[PDB]
Amino acid sequence: QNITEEFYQSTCSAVSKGYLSALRTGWYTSVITIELSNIKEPKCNGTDAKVKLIKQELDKYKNAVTELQLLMQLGVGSAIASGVAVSKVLHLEGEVNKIKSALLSTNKAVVSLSNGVSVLTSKVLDLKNYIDKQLLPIVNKQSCSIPNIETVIEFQQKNNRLLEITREFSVNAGVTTPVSTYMLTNSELLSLINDMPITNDQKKLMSNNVPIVRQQSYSIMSIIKEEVLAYVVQLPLYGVIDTPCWKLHTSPLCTTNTKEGSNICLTRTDRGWYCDNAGSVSFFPQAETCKVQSNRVFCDTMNSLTLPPEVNLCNVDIFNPKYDCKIMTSKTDVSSSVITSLGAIVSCYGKTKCTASNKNRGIIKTFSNGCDYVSNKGVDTVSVGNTLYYVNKQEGKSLYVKGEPIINFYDPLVFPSDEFDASISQVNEKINQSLAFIRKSDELLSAIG
Amino acid sequence: NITEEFYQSTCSAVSKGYLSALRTGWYTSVITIELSNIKEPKCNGTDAKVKLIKQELDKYKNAVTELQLLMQPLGVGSAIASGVAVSKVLHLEGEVNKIKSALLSTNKAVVSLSNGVSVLTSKVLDLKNYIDKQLLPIVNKQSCSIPNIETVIEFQQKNNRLLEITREFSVNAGVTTPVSTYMLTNSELLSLINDMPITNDQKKLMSNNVPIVRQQSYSIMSIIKEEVLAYVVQLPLYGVIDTPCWKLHTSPLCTTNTKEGSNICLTRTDRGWYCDNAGSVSFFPQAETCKVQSNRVFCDTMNSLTLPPEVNLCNVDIFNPKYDCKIMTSKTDVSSSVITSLGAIVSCYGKTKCTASNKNRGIIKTFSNGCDYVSNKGVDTVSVGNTLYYVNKQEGKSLYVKGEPIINFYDPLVFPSDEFDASISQVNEKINQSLAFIRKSDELLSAIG
Amino acid sequence: QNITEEFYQSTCSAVSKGYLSALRTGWYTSVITIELSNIKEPKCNGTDAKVKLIKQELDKYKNAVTELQLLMQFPLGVGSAIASGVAVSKVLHLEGEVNKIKSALLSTNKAVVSLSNGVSVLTSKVLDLKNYIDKQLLPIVNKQSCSIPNIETVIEFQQKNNRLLEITREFSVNAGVTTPVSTYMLTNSELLSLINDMPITNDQKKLMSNNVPIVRQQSYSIMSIIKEEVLAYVVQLPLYGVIDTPCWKLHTSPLCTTNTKEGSNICLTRTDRGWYCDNAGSVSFFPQAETCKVQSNRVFCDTMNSLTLPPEVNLCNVDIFNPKYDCKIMTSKTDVSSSVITSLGAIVSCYGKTKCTASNKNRGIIKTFSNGCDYVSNKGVDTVSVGNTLYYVNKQEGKSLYVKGEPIINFYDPLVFPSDEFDASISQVNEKINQSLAFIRKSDELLS
Amino acid sequence: QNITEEFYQSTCSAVSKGYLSALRTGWYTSVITIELSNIKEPKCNGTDAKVKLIKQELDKYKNAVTELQLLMQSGGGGSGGPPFPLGVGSAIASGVAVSKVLHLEGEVNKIKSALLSTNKAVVSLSNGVSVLTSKVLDLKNYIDKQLLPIVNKQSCSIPNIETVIEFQQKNNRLLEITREFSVNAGVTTPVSTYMLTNSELLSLINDMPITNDQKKLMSNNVPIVRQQSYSIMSIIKEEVLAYVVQLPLYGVIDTPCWKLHTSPLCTTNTKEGSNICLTRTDRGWYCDNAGSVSFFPQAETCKVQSNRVFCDTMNSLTLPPEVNLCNVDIFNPKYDCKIMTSKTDVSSSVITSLGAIVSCYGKTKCTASNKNRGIIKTFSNGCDYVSNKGVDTVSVGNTLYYVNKQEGKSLYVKGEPIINFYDPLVFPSDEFDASISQVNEKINQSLAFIRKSDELL
């Protein structure tokens, strides 16, 4: 493999490349079912120790049932419209029954619902069969033939799943992310992925990264009726796979020459993850949304902006004519560090002491005032002020790109020092507007001399 | 049962499993309408029913008048030359009389005409009977009996077919295709199919695909003389049937190696329908010259090429030695899509958006730059740029043939880049030529010592 | 509306601007039904003339029903237009669906119905031959003794049956899919009622309602099923997702040199002629002339017959040598006189001894053309005459402008000009010229 | 359940009306106790398998108790546990106050006596605060009776498998309670069924001193109540474990609410940087509240059921009702509508209660489509609105959004986008926060400077 990183001394930024995309574009929903002997209710004259335990469990099971019935009843959207769509179909009368019939002969079917959706169906727990067979004869009459100890233990363990489904939805109000292991066993998810109408490339991918698939899935609680508990599991579908990705890291760029509170600072405002997606670039500004396993980036495109491919030119030539590169400005000469994919960017301003260091021989570099970068080869920690940032130790090849820090090119009298969201062109229009005051208030003075 | 293979090497796909029905020849039959001779009313009465009956007389008379005017890499065919031959004989002296002689006592007979043209003939409407027995009796006398009201209504209905046949001929120079229920009702068309020198399975074939027969038939106005209207119907004769047909779709195949249009492009040009036929392959290159009902394929051999069965090897290995697969080359860096029988070929080039999507799930593939394929297995639409295509949803078995796109074997500087219809060998002729020059004139530059 | 045209003297091509888009991007399907009576040929042993006329029409109805039962069983791309409406057709083929629509319509003639593959469609009962036959016609003729029918019953049944036969006739020669959707398939009032009931914006309703003929052209009628005494056929209507974006039309004509020795000229023709409409930040390009239909200043096109181009395609009109987009051209040596009549003008390519003329209906010849590519507005011009061909100029009113400049065929050296290129570009010709220059200069340094 | 929505073209913003308030206005706190055994660690020699299992389960019980002691001393749960103009609260401030009273003298004993013949009582504390008090678990009774004569003696008597099993289950709730606390420094949200079973919480809701309408609202929306409730570890002493539970109190109910969605409003009149932008910034939830309008600007301090909006006023501002006049005329006289300006030409879509807002700028593929019909509108540059009338998705670039398919009626209010009235040569585009009037000033300043400057030249 190859993950590489370039550091642009001119812009105090770093682009780390070599990653492969896997972006969520679509959803697949499936219906999961637990089938309950709700009909059950215990009464009998027997009072063995082993009887009490089964009666206690029946109250637990019967409680979870009654509670579950009460519980039944930036770019903005709703993530779970697909699952809620299947949930509302399930409430149509007999739609639940279609599932029961299909799941009579095996525990995994493909039922086509009334809205023309063909969805995987799984029975994952058969509590009606266990109770009605091994339990109901025990506690229906009064002579209440006492069970063996293994039935006390077995019913208790089967009932455990149902109890922690109900615990989950007493605090989640029906919708969880990630979908939990009681919601769906890892073994069941693996069998679901194996049965999904997708490429064999996708199936291998979803199986390799089940933990990621969990975090990007939704459990949506649907119905309890006709002795069936049904909930929808909504899984990610990655339409984009193996396009190039790259991550942008950005730190402030300031003037060190002035030795006061008055200095101009400029920063690339467009950091985050980047992906090629259908002839454009999908950009994820909250890099908190993109999970990375190995060199693969798993993002949900619902959290992206779509940008023209020319945005990549702000990493080559920040002053290019083709893309209006976005920057911010401030007058805060504050030192900080940004740990990158296999390196570290340091901005060191003021009287702060900035260290690069190695766990075998202590301090191995002192930083000048200004913006600098070090590779993760021969550096373990980077210290800025009272902060010790450890550095990522993933293997890869780093590169230092030398250039004049572009903050030097700006003339501090006329610099718009407090631009929150501006660009390279927005800043020059502000500069030239300020020189407009300069020529006009000057040659007005040249009327009397 | 329809199957499909997509060859990724050559950006093409074959749809197998269809059954031939090829137009081998023609069957020409003569259709007669018996007409009373024009007798202008010569009657004075002014009841509204006489006015109405006279009005319909002039529609009839001005229709006989209109028909009197009317009577007086591929090959290049003459479609109705078969039917016109029969029409030409009827124009002869004493031939229309032969039709009358054989049709006094039947509504159908086989008549010998002078040129050895012995053709079946049918009398389909007898207006001379109706006019001379019921109508002009009242209206040809100097003072006219004023008619039945039901005679007014019935005469209009009887005359309707004669008027409509005249209209169809009058706006079509006398030749009509498809053949309508006015030239030939479905009752008579089925009757004629019962009496052709075809095998019974061919009689069944036509009698079930009657719309197809009509589309491929002609109706040639021939003569109006001797109280007789006659026109020639030309019905297709399907002499080769139930033999295997496969359809070849092809799409452009280009390198994406460089950006900014430095690419070379290659496209198979043999796209169309192929059918086994008497030890050869009939090739129909204009997929409109074929119709498809169910898994059947009605093609017209007149628009066909006869190819040796070795042409099929181009689908197996495009660099086979026996057949020289027709290819074209250009630099067309545009995106396109072909809907196959149970899939879609996508040739996504440049920076276009190309996706396959499912109606309930959303985007499920996002194609990379190059030639790919999706099957209708869980795919409902393909979108290329702004164009949205719908895939066929028939039940089928589609196989992806992995291989290397042969546009990469070719060097981008030896490539004859604008050849309309060359072959693999004709290009390798020009690669061999353009190569041989450079090595010589570069080795000629060696001996400057 | 304001229409403008510019003639680019440098590329022998004019661009008409100012049209307004209506690009069909999706389909809507409706199920149109005719409720039938399906009663057998009658046992009434009767002879009166009004009985005979009724029997003739009944066997017309029977034959039409049986005729319908037997019905069932270049840089561009390729699709199936009716694939959307064939979805709904085969939903109907499943038992249960026909009963659904029958229940929804036995009390009212218009409905919204949810078919079981997940589609909600408007459905209409347009003709009810069941209850007419069963209550006016079946009574008197299902008995061996026939009551003689009324005459106005004979006239009316023949009128009602007429639509069923006409729809049968249309389906019978068109394999069961028809375009345009006739007035027998859907009368004008029924269409405007559908348009009202569509879940479309209140603007698209105005567009379709005021362009009913064009909606007919880009629509389909799909014969679907007969059973349960119900005839149903699916009607598929255009949905113009793109509306009122700017559109423009590009006209092109061969641009050649004029120097005189027959067989010693190089030619060069822009090849991107067709319709262009702005569409979702790109340019949809309709290179087939037939596909786009122009009514008023509006251009109706089917997006499935289009190629999507980067917006920089438009720069080919202001600068064919532009850095960004490689403009598509073809070359040759075969130069003939020919004219292209534009939206509000005419391009004349006059070459050789051919005489070329523009003339007014009163002033006679108002222009005589020089050899080479030229233009003339439709202002005070009625006909253009190139050789023995007389073209008429369009008399649409609009403003036009003559962008003067040097024909680019002049810049090219005839002795290296690639004169065979069929589908080439400005840059492809540039590559081939630089190549042929090098070969000649290669042999020059390899003569020394 | 008549949800309706209007879209204002002039300001690029839609309002959903017809929701019902359920506002959290205050807190109810109740004390919950678990009786504990002061059992010393097993004192006997025993090696039977079942003696081992009971010994282990006692250690889990004993360890969990010293763990809970570690919480109640180091800290004790007593903690201090926002956008542009908002305030800053202290959620557990109410509950911790009751937690500290329990550390006083005899307040533990008042409860212990008050919960002797019952397991639910009312205690009036040493400060006059009357709190419901519930004993949920009695481990002292079980450990001392069924469990102590085994461990007490010099040689352990072997227990049953049933005693081994039943103790594992009685012990369980105490351990899970200790787990939750040990991982949260003794303050937990939401309140779990371990902290408080649905049986206990619905019984607790009934006994509370609140209206009948409040009881109905709370007893139905149990998960929302759990999400909005805190559980504060308080004290372990006196052989009693007691923790405070802080429940939301809905003092405002059934008043009308509405939600405002906004999007950028950018001039399309030019190419690339020449465009200038306006955007309303008062988006969020509004509810009529005591003749004022409570504004919830983070719409996710609110949770939404059918028709019903559960907001928390700690994240609210209080506004005069004239604020709604911003949704009929952004240039109104009474209230100064707050906006923001920029030069940011990137497309964006908002999903509303029953519609979609699309801000298509530059060259994005902005599109709204249907499951079975395909694209039913391609947006052109500007700010447009589509309802969910047979609309299932909206695509902006590569991003697919699903429209709300809520059943309701939608109104498109036509108007001139106000961004077209502003002179782009003298327009201010820095404003993180500004009002309509504040922008008119900065334009009055600039245009009146050129009044004087035109004079002198």
PDB file of C-alpha atoms in Angstrom, chain D residues 180-305:
ATOM      1  CA  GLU D 180     -24.010   2.993  34.932  1.00  0.00           C
ATOM      2  CA  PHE D 181     -22.897   5.256  37.779  1.00  0.00           C
ATOM      3  CA  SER D 182     -19.261   4.100  37.751  1.00  0.00           C
ATOM      4  CA  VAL D 183     -18.985   5.076  34.064  1.00  0.00           C
ATOM      5  CA  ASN D 184     -20.753   8.464  34.382  1.00  0.00           C
ATOM      6  CA  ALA D 185     -19.392   9.845  37.689  1.00  0.00           C
ATOM      7  CA  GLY D 186     -22.825   9.180  39.154  1.00  0.00           C
ATOM      8  CA  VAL D 187     -25.044  11.266  36.848  1.00  0.00           C
ATOM      9  CA  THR D 188     -26.862   9.506  33.989  1.00  0.00           C
ATOM     10  CA  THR D 189     -29.088  10.529  31.056  1.00  0.00           C
ATOM     11  CA  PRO D 190     -31.365   9.002  29.841  1.00  0.00           C
ATOM     12  CA  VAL D 191     -32.740   7.178  32.909  1.00  0.00           C
ATOM     13  CA  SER D 192     -32.519   3.440  32.290  1.00  0.00           C
ATOM     14  CA  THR D 193     -34.974   0.740  33.294  1.00  0.00           C
ATOM     15  CA  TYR D 194     -32.291  -0.432  35.741  1.00  0.00           C
ATOM     16  CA  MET D 195     -32.422   2.939  37.498  1.00  0.00           C
ATOM     17  CA  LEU D 196     -36.212   3.017  37.210  1.00  0.00           C
ATOM     18  CA  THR D 197     -38.453   0.330  35.734  1.00  0.00           C
ATOM     19  CA  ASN D 198     -41.438   1.343  33.625  1.00  0.00           C
ATOM     20  CA  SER D 199     -43.570  -0.153  36.398  1.00  0.00           C
ATOM     21  CA  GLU D 200     -41.966   2.196  38.926  1.00  0.00           C
ATOM     22  CA  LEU D 201     -41.927   5.286  36.704  1.00  0.00           C
ATOM     23  CA  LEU D 202     -45.588   5.090  35.695  1.00  0.00           C
ATOM     24  CA  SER D 203     -46.517   4.462  39.326  1.00  0.00           C
ATOM     25  CA  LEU D 204     -44.301   7.424  40.218  1.00  0.00           C
ATOM     26  CA  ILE D 205     -46.027   9.609  37.612  1.00  0.00           C
ATOM     27  CA  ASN D 206     -49.460   8.854  39.082  1.00  0.00           C
ATOM     28  CA  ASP D 207     -48.456   9.729  42.653  1.00  0.00           C
ATOM     29  CA  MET D 208     -46.873  13.034  41.586  1.00  0.00           C
ATOM     30  CA  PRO D 209     -48.614  16.344  42.446  1.00  0.00           C
ATOM     31  CA  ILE D 210     -49.345  17.327  38.837  1.00  0.00           C
ATOM     32  CA  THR D 211     -52.399  17.786  36.640  1.00  0.00           C
ATOM     33  CA  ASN D 212     -54.266  14.913  35.027  1.00  0.00           C
ATOM     34  CA  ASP D 213     -53.327  16.222  31.576  1.00  0.00           C
ATOM     35  CA  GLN D 214     -49.661  16.190  32.616  1.00  0.00           C
ATOM     36  CA  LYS D 215     -50.012  12.605  33.846  1.00  0.00           C
ATOM     37  CA  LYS D 216     -51.489  11.553  30.496  1.00  0.00           C
ATOM     38  CA  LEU D 217     -48.740  13.315  28.533  1.00  0.00           C
ATOM     39  CA  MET D 218     -45.945  11.863  30.675  1.00  0.00           C
ATOM     40  CA  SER D 219     -47.422   8.365  31.030  1.00  0.00           C
ATOM     41  CA  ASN D 220     -47.715   8.071  27.243  1.00  0.00           C
ATOM     42  CA  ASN D 221     -44.364   9.566  26.175  1.00  0.00           C
ATOM     43  CA  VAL D 222     -42.261   7.471  28.540  1.00  0.00           C
ATOM     44  CA  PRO D 223     -39.150   7.348  26.272  1.00  0.00           C
ATOM     45  CA  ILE D 224     -39.152  11.143  25.853  1.00  0.00           C
ATOM     46  CA  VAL D 225     -39.451  11.484  29.630  1.00  0.00           C
ATOM     47  CA  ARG D 226     -36.559   9.048  30.085  1.00  0.00           C
ATOM     48  CA  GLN D 227     -34.450  10.968  27.559  1.00  0.00           C
ATOM     49  CA  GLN D 228     -35.171  14.219  29.424  1.00  0.00           C
ATOM     50  CA  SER D 229     -34.569  12.807  32.927  1.00  0.00           C
ATOM     51  CA  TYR D 230     -31.392  12.591  35.016  1.00  0.00           C
ATOM     52  CA  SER D 231     -30.364  10.072  37.686  1.00  0.00           C
ATOM     53  CA  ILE D 232     -28.002  11.444  40.335  1.00  0.00           C
ATOM     54  CA  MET D 233     -26.117   9.127  42.669  1.00  0.00           C
ATOM     55  CA  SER D 234     -26.615  10.656  46.122  1.00  0.00           C
ATOM     56  CA  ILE D 235     -25.701   8.659  49.265  1.00  0.00           C
ATOM     57  CA  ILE D 236     -24.835   5.189  50.497  1.00  0.00           C
ATOM     58  CA  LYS D 237     -24.982   4.843  54.293  1.00  0.00           C
ATOM     59  CA  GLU D 238     -27.234   3.395  56.986  1.00  0.00           C
ATOM     60  CA  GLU D 239     -27.344   0.106  55.026  1.00  0.00           C
ATOM     61  CA  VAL D 240     -29.343   2.112  52.453  1.00  0.00           C
ATOM     62  CA  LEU D 241     -28.417   3.101  48.908  1.00  0.00           C
ATOM     63  CA  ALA D 242     -30.388   6.139  47.751  1.00  0.00           C
ATOM     64  CA  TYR D 243     -30.150   8.177  44.549  1.00  0.00           C
ATOM     65  CA  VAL D 244     -32.120  11.167  43.275  1.00  0.00           C
ATOM     66  CA  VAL D 245     -34.098  11.016  40.029  1.00  0.00           C
ATOM     67  CA  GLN D 246     -34.856  14.309  38.257  1.00  0.00           C
ATOM     68  CA  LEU D 247     -37.935  14.143  35.966  1.00  0.00           C
ATOM     69  CA  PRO D 248     -39.076  16.824  33.504  1.00  0.00           C
ATOM     70  CA  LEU D 249     -42.129  18.873  34.449  1.00  0.00           C
ATOM     71  CA  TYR D 250     -44.232  20.096  31.519  1.00  0.00           C
ATOM     72  CA  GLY D 251     -45.721  23.387  32.686  1.00  0.00           C
ATOM     73  CA  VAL D 252     -46.660  24.492  29.159  1.00  0.00           C
ATOM     74  CA  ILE D 253     -48.761  22.099  27.072  1.00  0.00           C
ATOM     75  CA  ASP D 254     -51.029  22.240  24.000  1.00  0.00           C
ATOM     76  CA  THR D 255     -50.047  25.761  23.002  1.00  0.00           C
ATOM     77  CA  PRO D 256     -49.491  26.233  19.250  1.00  0.00           C
ATOM     78  CA  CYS D 257     -45.978  25.791  17.881  1.00  0.00           C
ATOM     79  CA  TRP D 258     -44.404  26.390  14.498  1.00  0.00           C
ATOM     80  CA  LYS D 259     -41.043  25.655  12.898  1.00  0.00           C
ATOM     81  CA  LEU D 260     -39.021  27.916  10.610  1.00  0.00           C
ATOM     82  CA  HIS D 261     -36.680  26.592   7.916  1.00  0.00           C
ATOM     83  CA  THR D 262     -34.256  28.897   6.104  1.00  0.00           C
ATOM     84  CA  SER D 263     -31.774  28.708   3.248  1.00  0.00           C
ATOM     85  CA  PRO D 264     -29.397  31.075   1.429  1.00  0.00           C
ATOM     86  CA  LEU D 265     -30.890  33.714  -0.880  1.00  0.00           C
ATOM     87  CA  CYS D 266     -28.286  34.608  -3.505  1.00  0.00           C
ATOM     88  CA  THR D 267     -28.529  36.867  -6.543  1.00  0.00           C
ATOM     89  CA  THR D 268     -28.258  34.828  -9.744  1.00  0.00           C
ATOM     90  CA  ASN D 269     -27.764  37.919 -11.934  1.00  0.00           C
ATOM     91  CA  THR D 270     -24.057  37.309 -12.633  1.00  0.00           C
ATOM     92  CA  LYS D 271     -21.212  34.787 -12.788  1.00  0.00           C
ATOM     93  CA  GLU D 272     -18.909  33.451 -10.027  1.00  0.00           C
ATOM     94  CA  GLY D 273     -17.968  36.080  -7.407  1.00  0.00           C
ATOM     95  CA  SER D 274     -20.309  38.866  -8.544  1.00  0.00           C
ATOM     96  CA  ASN D 275     -23.181  37.293  -6.569  1.00  0.00           C
ATOM     97  CA  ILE D 276     -24.163  38.459  -3.081  1.00  0.00           C
ATOM     98  CA  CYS D 277     -26.187  36.554  -0.501  1.00  0.00           C
ATOM     99  CA  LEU D 278     -28.721  36.976   2.300  1.00  0.00           C
ATOM    100  CA  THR D 279     -30.009  34.370   4.739  1.00  0.00           C
ATOM    101  CA  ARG D 280     -32.518  34.499   7.572  1.00  0.00           C
ATOM    102  CA  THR D 281     -31.025  33.329  10.868  1.00  0.00           C
ATOM    103  CA  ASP D 282     -34.063  33.026  13.168  1.00  0.00           C
ATOM    104  CA  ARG D 283     -34.667  29.394  12.204  1.00  0.00           C
ATOM    105  CA  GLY D 284     -35.839  27.007  14.894  1.00  0.00           C
ATOM    106  CA  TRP D 285     -38.929  26.178  16.928  1.00  0.00           C
ATOM    107  CA  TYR D 286     -41.409  28.769  18.183  1.00  0.00           C
ATOM    108  CA  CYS D 287     -44.218  28.176  20.670  1.00  0.00           C
ATOM    109  CA  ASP D 288     -46.752  30.633  22.037  1.00  0.00           C
ATOM    110  CA  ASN D 289     -45.769  30.842  25.697  1.00  0.00           C
ATOM    111  CA  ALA D 290     -47.454  33.055  28.321  1.00  0.00           C
ATOM    112  CA  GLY D 291     -48.251  35.733  25.751  1.00  0.00           C
ATOM    113  CA  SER D 292     -44.630  35.708  24.582  1.00  0.00           C
ATOM    114  CA  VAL D 293     -42.990  33.455  22.009  1.00  0.00           C
ATOM    115  CA  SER D 294     -40.435  30.991  23.322  1.00  0.00           C
ATOM    116  CA  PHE D 295     -37.800  30.506  20.626  1.00  0.00           C
ATOM    117  CA  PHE D 296     -35.754  27.306  20.462  1.00  0.00           C
ATOM    118  CA  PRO D 297     -32.930  28.066  17.995  1.00  0.00           C
ATOM    119  CA  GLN D 298     -31.278  24.667  18.311  1.00  0.00           C
ATOM    120  CA  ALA D 299     -34.210  22.681  16.947  1.00  0.00           C
ATOM    121  CA  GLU D 300     -32.628  19.577  18.569  1.00  0.00           C
ATOM    122  CA  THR D 301     -33.166  20.607  22.127  1.00  0.00           C
ATOM    123  CA  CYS D 302     -36.646  19.631  20.911  1.00  0.00           C
ATOM    124  CA  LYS D 303     -37.979  16.157  20.172  1.00  0.00           C
ATOM    125  CA  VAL D 304     -41.032  15.758  17.959  1.00  0.00           C
ATOM    126  CA  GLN D 305     -43.832  13.218  18.240  1.00  0.00           C
TER     127      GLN D 305
END
